[PDB]
Design a protein around this ligand. Structure first.
Ligand SMILES: O=S(=O)(Nc1cc(-c2ccc3nccc(N4CCOCC4)c3c2)cnc1Cl)c1ccc(F)cc1
Length: 834
């Protein structure tokens, strides 16, 4: 039809990629995945309560922390319900379910609802108000129409083959380039290379032919599902220059066969891009390789105590961190005591790394082993452990599926906490259709807030990653076909706004030399007025805060920043008349940088906060909204009432940097209305500073120049610009920070004794989740930093978290770091200014 044609055109423009396109395939996996995702979409759509879907209550079933209880007025919270101009105020108790006080309670100025069978202490908006110490303002409203969510009507056994595996390398071709070059062919399973063959070296001409069979030692019957033929091109120590990958057992369990011309990826170690089954879309410029797979259709089938010192050796092995390398001795031990090891969920990652995946009978015993998993199925969810099983070390669908099984029990509050890393982990899936892809699909469709962030996270990777754009596009399409017309319209509006603003960023960045022109400010405001009538939708959801709807631009307040990437400083009015403010919505619109590294670090900061909540600590971090939106384009939340530490020094002192200890402290008092609020500022500063000292040490991003650090007018310290990373320093504890606490060079202050108190406790709390943080750190580097990441980069966090050390000793180690910062004073800060 035509209605079912212009709708795909709509899907395409929302997705940023054409999913029906077959210009860059060599089998039908992508198309097979589209048809396969119809079923899980349908089930989730059909079983979601239409009413609860449309109001999307954002709820938690976690306990209310000790830091929030001490801020109640003894078992009583205040809720202001609203008329038109006036308002009524109700006395409430934390257990009063929405219905205890048709009509619905919508938060003033936000598409956020207080509805459903949960106590009001179990709402995030309520806990937000309580955290910042603000009154809850709501409106008696009409529930939205679920009709707006309406969804438009949518043979030889392999184990019977003793032949050794063989692949014919016909040769390579490249339109443009000289030394010597050879092709390496690896049977891979995860990062585990099972068998390796090389060709003879040949001269590197624009076309090089071999026509040789490479006979491997692995038999066909021993090929596991998810095994990759990985083809690499080395020039000559040698050097890797091109790689492509091909699945040996395709999506139907059929062995791969016939002719292949694969266009290959260029090189700029452990990196997610290296594992992709996607071929290079750049048909014109990219190197290709011509191969022949030949062996009748062959299909893989599906299937239907110990001594003292050894138990101890095994337990020591199970105890070690996820980055502790297993020796052959350890693996052989784990596998032999297979069934003892299965009694310990913590042993699953190491045990499944003890499996000889290239030996058919071993795999069979491994699948037998998984069939007997009462203990695994019974234990409480550990995200750490579960994440470990989704990383690049595991390619077995069954192994990976028992990880996804655990995630299924995750409450929506926590999916949101791990969504970004979960979406990144799709890049570790051998096949386009995986249990994890389906999990993300149905959790997103069950919940408008997960689905909103799912959209952007997926879209972020489609726009700037060729290596996985096809896979993420299919999954995104499957999502959009279930999210419902009311969300398709939001997405459409958001896409239009950022596409429009992009154009304005482009032409403006070119009109400036490498400060800021005066004409240019008027030139920007000129084009922004041009938009306000043009075709700009006069209300769109804020990508990083889907509660807020933005309306008209506040043109007068809009400017180009003094940064040499010339980002746009934009302000918007809230489209909601029910808003009881006036404060504009401030968004930084940036080109030049890829915001994905920033997204990752910030999300990890959030994870660190929720970690700290389990131990009733609130280190007042400020992880501001930051959404990559397109290719090298995104938005950043403007934090109100904030300035950079550096600018505070350029206000009292001046240019070069004769830094003074007092300058921060009396900046605080001049922005403090009273002594009452000034102390709360010093209070907020002690916590903030403690959070960012700990967080950044662990992540190894603590040494920042002080224009990249900010403070709010109420004490809240917070770091910025994470997407960038001699004598070193563990973090930033400069004298101006230290004097706010009341110390100079070598002393101890009451507020400082608190800083040391909170850090030590925050640090040790993180250490109780060593495994989880190690795994998120590993995954971050492998999927987020195109840094050809090494073990040594990863095994930094082993140092930072003082693995294998007692608590006493870990307290000492960090306290040394504090003292290291003291010794340097201003040496590192001045050193940047070269
Ligand atoms: O504008 S940027 O190009 N990008 C960017 C901005 C922010 C950010 C987030 C929230 C903010 N809230 C309030 C005020 C901000 N300002 C930043 C400094 O200039 C004054 C205004 C905020 C900035 C965070 N991360 C990045 Cl990558 C940039 C600018 C200066 C820097 F030193 C490095 C980066």
């Amino acid at each position: 039809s035509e209605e079912s044609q212009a709708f795909q055109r709509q899907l395409t423009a929302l997705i940023g990629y054409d999913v029906t396109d077959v210009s860059n395939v060599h089998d039908d996996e992508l198309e097979f995945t589209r048809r396969g995702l119809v079923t899980p979409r349908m089930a989730e759509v059909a079983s979601r309560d239409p009413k609860l879907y449309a109001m999307h209550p954002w709820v938690t079933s976690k306990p209310l922390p000790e830091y929030l209880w001490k801020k109640i007025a003894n078992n009583c919270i205040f809720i202001v319900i609203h008329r038109s101009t006036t308002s009524q105020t109700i006395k409430v108790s934390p257990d009063d379910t929405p219905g205890a006080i048709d009509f619905v309670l919508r938060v003033c100025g936000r598409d956020e609802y207080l509805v459903g069978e949960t106590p009001i202490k179990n709402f995030q908006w309520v806990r937000h108000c309580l955290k910042n110490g603000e009154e809850i303002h709501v409106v008696l409203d009409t529930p939205p129409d679920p009709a707006l969510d309406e969804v438009r009507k949518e043979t030889v056994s392999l184990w019977d083959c003793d032949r050794k595996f063989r692949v014919k390398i016909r040769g390579i071709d490249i339109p443009v380039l000289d030394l010597t070059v050879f092709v390496e062919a690896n049977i891979q399973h995860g990062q585990q290379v099972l068998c390796q063959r090389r060709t003879s070296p040949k001269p590197f001409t624009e076309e090089v032919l071999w026509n040789v069979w490479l006979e491997f030692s692995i038999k066909i019957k021993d090929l596991p599902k998810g095994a990759l033929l990985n083809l690499q091109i080395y020039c000559g120590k040698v050097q890797l220059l091109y790689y492509v990958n091909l699945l040996l057992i395709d999506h139907r369990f059929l062995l791969r066969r016939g002719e292949y011309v694969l266009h290959m990826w260029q090189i700029s170690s452990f990196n997610a891009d290296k594992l992709t089954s996607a071929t290079n879309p750049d048909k014109e410029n990219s190197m290709s390789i011509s191969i022949l797979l030949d062996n009748h259709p062959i299909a893989l089938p599906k299937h239907q105590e110990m001594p003292n010192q050894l138990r101890k050796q095994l337990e020591a092995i199970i105890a070690t961190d996820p980055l502790n390398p297993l020796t052959a001795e350890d693996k052989e031990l784990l596998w032999h005591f297979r069934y003892e090891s299965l009694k310990h969920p913590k042993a699953y990652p190491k045990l499944f790394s003890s499996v000889k995946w290239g030996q058919q009978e071993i795999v069979a015993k491994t699948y037998q082993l998984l069939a007997r998993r009462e203990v695994w199925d019974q234990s409480a969810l550990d995200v750490g452990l579960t994440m470990q099983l989704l990383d690049c070390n595991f390619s077995d669908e069954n192994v990976r599926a028992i990880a996804v099984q655990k995630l299924e029990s995750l409450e929506d509050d926590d999916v949101l906490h791990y969504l970004l890393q979960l979406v990144q982990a799709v890049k570790f899936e051998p096949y386009h259709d995986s249990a994890l892809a389906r999990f993300l699909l149905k959790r997103g469709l069950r919940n408008k807030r997960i689905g909103h962030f799912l959209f952007w996270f997926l879209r972020s990777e489609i726009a700037q990653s060729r290596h996985y754009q096809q896979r993420f596009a299919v999954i995104l399409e499957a999502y959009l076909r279930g999210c419902g017309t009311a969300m398709l319209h939001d997405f459409t509006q958001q896409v239009q706004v950022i596409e429009m603003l992009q154009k304005v960023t482009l032409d403006i960045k070119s009109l400036s030399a490498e400060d800021v022109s005066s004409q240019v400010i008027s030139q920007l405001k000129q084009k922004l007025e041009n938009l306000q009538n043009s075709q700009l939708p006069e209300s769109f959801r804020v990508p990083y805060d889907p509660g807020l709807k933005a309306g008209a631009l506040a043109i007068e307040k809009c400017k180009v920043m003094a940064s040499k990437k010339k980002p746009l400083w934009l302000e918007f009015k809230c489209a909601d008349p029910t808003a009881l403010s006036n404060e504009t919505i401030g968004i930084i619109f940036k080109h030049g940088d890829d915001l994905r590294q920033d997204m990752l670090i910030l999300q990890i900061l959030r994870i660190m906060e929720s970690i700290w909540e389990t131990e009733s600590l609130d280190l007042c971090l400020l992880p501001y909204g930051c959404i990559s939106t397109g290719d090298k384009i995104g938005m950043i939340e403007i934090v109100k009432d904030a300035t950079t530490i550096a600018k505070i020094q350029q206000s009292t002192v001046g240019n070069t940097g004769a830094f003074k200890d007092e300058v921060l402290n009396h900046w605080l008092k001049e922005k403090s209305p009273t002594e009452e609020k000034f102390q709360a500022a010093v209070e907020r500063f002690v916590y903030s500073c403690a959070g960012y000292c700990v967080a950044t040490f662990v992540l190894g991003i603590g040494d920042r120049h002080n224009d990249n650090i900010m403070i709010t007018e109420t004490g809240n310290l917070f770091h910025i610009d994470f997407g960038h990373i001699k004598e070193r320093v563990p973090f930033v504890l400069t004298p101006d920070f230290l004097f706010v606490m009341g110390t100079s060079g070598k002393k101890t202050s009451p507020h400082f004794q608190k800083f040391q108190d909170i850090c030590v406790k925050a640090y040790l709390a993180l250490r109780h989740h060593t495994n989880l943080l190690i795994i998120l750190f590993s995954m971050m580097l492998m999927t987020g930093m195109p840094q050809l990441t090494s073990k040594e980069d990863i095994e930094y966090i082993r140092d930072a978290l003082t693995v294998g050390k007692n608590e006493e000793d870990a307290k000492k180690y960090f306290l040394d770091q504090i003292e290291v910062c003291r010794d340097k004073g201003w040496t590192v800060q001045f050193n940047w200014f070269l």
